[PDB]
C-alpha cells in the first residue's frame, strides 16, 4: 500500500482523486483502475495515462483520433510514460512503472484520453 494506489472512475465521468503522491523509495509503483457503474466502455470508458503536464494536450488531441481499439492513444507515442487500457463498468486494469522515469524539475499529470473526458478527468502526480 506504500507503492500502489487504486483510483475509481465512474458513470458520471470523474476519477475519485485529483492528486497522487509517489514516495521516492518505491522502485516500481502500481496504479489499479476500477470502474463502478453500469455503462459500457464505448459509452463511458476510461483509462489512466501519465505524462509531463506540458505533453498532456498533445497526447489527448492525437489519442482521440486513434480509436477505441488503440485505447485512444496513438500507437507507440513516446510522450506517454505509462497507461492502462480503456475499461467499461465492472472491469479493471493495472499498470506498474519505474519511478525513476519521473525526473526532478518537471511537473506531471494524469488524465483519461476518452473523447471529451479530460475537462473533468485529470490531476497531478508528484514524487515525494
Ligand atoms: Cu474517461
Q: Are 82 and 95 in contact (CB under 8 A)?
A: yes
- 35 annotated ligand binder: no
Helix (H, G, I), strand (E, B) or coil at 97: strand
Between CA 62 and CA 82 the distance in angstroms is 16
* 86-95-97-2 Cα dihedral, nearest 10 degrees: 130
Instruction: Give φ, ψ of 61 to 5 degrees.
Output: -60, -50
Nearest to 110 by CA among 90, 80, 69, 70: 80
CA 19 to centroid of ligand 1, rounded, Å = 16
Helix (H, G, I), strand (E, B) or coil at 26: coil
What is the experimental method? X-ray
Q: Are 8 and 74 in contact (CB under 8 A)?
A: no
Give the torsion sign (CA, 106, 18, 117, 93): positive
How many structural domains does the chain have? 1
- 112 annotated ligand binder: yes
Q: Burial level of 19, CB count in 10 A (0-12/13-18/19+)?
A: exposed
What letters, b where the CB count within 10 A reaches 16 and e where it falls short, cover 84-102?
A: bbbbbbeeebebebeeeeb
Experimental resolution (Å):
2.0
CA 112 to centroid of ligand 1, rounded, Å = 5
Task: Residue 92: give the domain boundaries.
Answer: 1-128
Strands (E) located in 2-117: 4-9, 19-22, 28-35, 49-52, 82-83, 92-98, 108-111
- 83 annotated ligand binder: no
Separation of CA 24 from chain center: 20
Give me the CATH number covering residue 6.
2.60.40.420
Amino acid at each position: 500500500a506504500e507503492c500502489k494506489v487504486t483510483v475509481d472512475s465512474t458513470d458520471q465521468m470523474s476519477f475519485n482523486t485529483k492528486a497522487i503522491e509517489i514516495d521516492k523509495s518505491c522502485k516500481t509503483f502500481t496504479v489499479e483502475l476500477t470502474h463502478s457503474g453500469s455503462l459500457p466502455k464505448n459509452v463511458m470508458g476510461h483509462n489512466w495515462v501519465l505524462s509531463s503536464a506540458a505533453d498532456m494536450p498533445g497526447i489527448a488531441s492525437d489519442g482521440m483520433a486513434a480509436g477505441i481499439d488503440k485505447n485512444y492513444l496513438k500507437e507507440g507515442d513516446t510522450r506517454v510514460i505509462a497507461h492502462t487500457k480503456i475499461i467499461g463498468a465492472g472491469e479493471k486494469d493495472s499498470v506498474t512503472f519505474d519511478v525513476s522515469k519521473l525526473a526532478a524539475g518537471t511537473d506531471y499529470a494524469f488524465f483519461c484520453s476518452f473523447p471529451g473526458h479530460i475537462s473533468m478527468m485529470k490531476g497531478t502526480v508528484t514524487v515525494k
